[model samples]
Target: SESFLLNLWILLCACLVLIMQAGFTCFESGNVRNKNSVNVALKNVSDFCVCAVCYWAFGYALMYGNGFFYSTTTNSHETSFFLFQLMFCCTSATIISGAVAERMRFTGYILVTLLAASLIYPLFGHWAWGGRILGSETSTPGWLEQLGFIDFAGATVVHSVGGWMALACVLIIGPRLGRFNNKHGVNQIFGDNLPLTALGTFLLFLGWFGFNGGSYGKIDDMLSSVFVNTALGGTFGGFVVLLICIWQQSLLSIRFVLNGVLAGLVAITASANSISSIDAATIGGISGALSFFATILLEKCKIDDVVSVVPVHLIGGIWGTLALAIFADGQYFIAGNSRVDQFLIQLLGVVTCGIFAFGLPYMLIRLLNRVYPLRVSPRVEILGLNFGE
Candidate 1:
């Protein structure tokens, strides 16, 4: 393909990836309480704006440049990639938007978004994706890449990093009022707009093609195969969760099914460019089932992740990244290396990412909360954020 076609196709993919913000915007609006729905909608908008600016001024620099604010357009080849990557940065922080929904102060959310977009996300993104320079083909590899760690897209870079950061924020902010009153026995909060939520989920399914497919960094014949793998991952993920709900005899929750599809999509991201259709289905199916279990696991600990971000993104991202080693096409791995060695390296990258994403935010937010306070006062929280707004 011509370089002109490559740049245009990449720009088109960036536009598609950018639409995921709408999908996530709707997803959270449908997940929070009616009173808090408008509140989170604004956070979704404001958070992206904050994240976008922070990423442009800081993240793009640290992830791919040397100076504080490099004129990214100076490098024609890097410009479209920069555009595509900015959307990815916003997404990493958006995961926290849902995790801290309903009770966190808007200012607090913005601060966290700054920390994520500027530091946590970009630094680790450097570790996983920084080996090659976008403007020039340099063989310099990130430490993880040198060790044969492969995360084709952002399963770990974006999804798990966001998921881990969400966990930290949730733990620090605590659950929404009455979410886990022991006497009341886990007060349930249902979203008012299921149809909107469904619409958002379908939108997410569409955006995922751009997220995974665009990671190819160019157009090619295998592109169609990657898109097929992406769809299968999502379809089987939703299907498996539906089956689990049937087997569990609870009739299950629609949110679980929706999240299952998302989890599967997240899991397939790591291997979408490398694995076959059947293997993608297998990994995605497993991730969907695992998302359900991860949800339960967090609930048992009373972690209270509002939108199931931990299960869908954290658990699913980890599974997908690790699945790359398991479902490898053999061409991607170097010669004379055992699959076991590859799996261990994958494990190292996951632990490296999980700890950094989780721990830095945890300590930073906790310390900041000691002075600034992350959650709203009980008075404002109980009245609904809209009332205070």
Candidate 2:
């Protein structure tokens, strides 16, 4: 009976995490241009499908395997954990879909999704969550153990890994057609609606309670800390981003600030258990600042991060993971090693996760672009996503 209850609890928490897809769709779709609305929706729907399939297959085994190889017990845990972690993987991948909406070809984006859902997301997940590689001695490489690399809840692996991939995608896609002024060479595209985005933000906030809280595996002592930090970090993170955007852009743009909330959530995800409420606020504040600056940086570079997911998720994830080393108790709380030792490990984790997530997708996209063509015709994009349909 006790075993059954535990299994039931795991499944229930997994379900809550899965439901967050709707929250992402709402938040992301609300911020993008109206013409690309359906495109954003399609990306979300497709991502969930991709995650469900890929996670059940290789991702589960890669992440949960014990003793550095796929054993029966490892495989079973992998499957169960995959069900819990898949939701987070899909959430991270979903961030990029919004950033590239309305510009990149669906086929091209789908290819990226295949890579993300199948190899990119799962491998990193394996490294972080699986007992081997990032999670444990057997799975982790010798050099990593020698140098140090640890991630308690995949701040780098699950969240940043997706963000890095999203960054590469946006850089390849470029800003939407005419997003930049001919003379000025840089400016805003001005998305359609804030209402939907605002709602999405609220939904994401609600879902995040599950995102971080559920990582605990069941309600316990750490739940309060997780809840407090999640709330504190999210509020301040969004506010910081809002203020930064206003300072730079000289307007209270709801969309720009709205993304700050998500950035904060992503940043805190890795250190949710380690950091206190105060640390959470600081993390949120930094994330907020970065969110505003990252948007500007993307625009200047001509990257088309339509929803700023790359900056907020990828960059924020790094910040949170690293912060865990500083603010967190380290060996006591997460990696079970000294603080300094754990810090080094966390750094390595960030670098490894970033390289694989960013590099893999970039290579795949480049290959796909050459083989099948990546960009949508200007005509098709301007008419919105329905041109083909």
Candidate 3:
């Protein structure tokens, strides 16, 4: 009620952050070949569209249904809190679009978006924030409440939800044509245009300021620290990746740098307001370094994460959450920051989320593939989805 105008401003920022789905689509589509470019774009568009409806109808209610959500924060904000958080739910669903690119069938993607937006994302949101299921008195599924996980601002909830889903989908959907071969191993899948990727990455960087920044709520004083942490995390993260790539092979890899920005943002999300500025910088640097390695690891593991979403989001989120423990000098309000304890909790959260949000959906993909093929026919893949019959 006090910062009513501030609320409006933050909501608008949230909208801008949400518009970033387009940036992701363009960047990912541009990063891949023309053959399946439009298909990935279509999936991105449809994921957002489905997310709007699903979050509105089910996720909003589920995340804010009861007054009993979790520790620290209060539900005094009520429905307003739910609506604000709904944008975050939609954001997570969009992350999967890039990871499962190229060959995935539109039908399977459509259903997955619906289920994730309404079911998977919301359930986790409730477990983390909604009071009824995870708070003081109410009983929830053992799976939900057993772990006293801390997400602060959704390193796990936002990034991991999408990150784990990306992992599952990429593994199930496999790779694009000529992407992987038994004899050749894994090959690079070039995008139709590098310009598009550059543009998309720029827009994503811009929106990320708002994405993590806006979550600090409508209060100007409170948001200031969060804003600073967000920018620092991303900036340092990008540079570190560039340096690492240069160090490893003396090349400033665009993909590594671009995704480093995202990883830094993810790392800072959990403790944006709570961590010190120095800690924020450290978090960003580590996230960048880890993401660089994680991307290479995913490729080596033959997981085929199309746009490196797993590295950027999953590894980034884990590092961000764990960073809270490392940087917790007993200064902040949420500083139950014992490194060992926090790491365990972070690991538990990641494993638990992957099992349900990712593992279950992965099985669903298999089921859907059996009933109605998951990838487009080779013919459709050969010609860009933009071309009409």
Which is the leading candidate under TM-score? 1
TM-score of 3: 0.87
In candidate 2, which residue pairs clash? 99-306, 132-139, 132-140, 133-139, 133-140, 148-345, 149-345, 150-345, 331-337
CA displacement after TM-score superposition, residue 132 of candidate 1 (Å): 4.0
Residue 387 deviation, candidate 2, in Å?
2.4
Sort all candidates by TM-score, best to worst. 1, 2, 3
Q: How do the residues 1-389 of candidate 1 rate in per-residue lDDT, one tens digit apiece?
A: 47778778778878877778899999999887788899999999998999888887888778865335546455556777787888889888887788888889988888898899878998998888886555566546677777778888789999999999999988898887777767756666788887788888898888899888678876779899889999999999999999888655331378889999999999998889999989999999999999999988887777888889999999999999898988978788877777888889899999999889999889999999999998999988878887773
Candidate 3 residues 215-270, lDDT tens each? Answer: 66556576877788888888999888877777554212777888898889889988
lDDT of 2 by residue, 1-389 (tens): 54455456556666767666787888777767788887778878987787667766666665554422323443333334556776777776786677777787876777788788778876666555554431123553334433555555556877787778878877776667777876878766665766777878887887777777667655456778888998998899888876665555522367667778888888888778778888899998888788778877877876777778777787788888888878876444434577676767787777787788888788878777777877788888889874562
Better of 1 and 3 by lDDT: 1
TM value for model 1:
0.96
Residue 310, candidate 1: Cα error in Å is 0.3
The lDDT of model 2 is: 0.72
Candidate 3 segments exceeding 4 Å error: 67-82, 132-148, 218-222, 247-252, 329-339, 387-389
TM-score of each: 0.96, 0.87, 0.87
Give the residue spans of candidate 1 off by over 4 A.
Answer: 66-74, 247-252
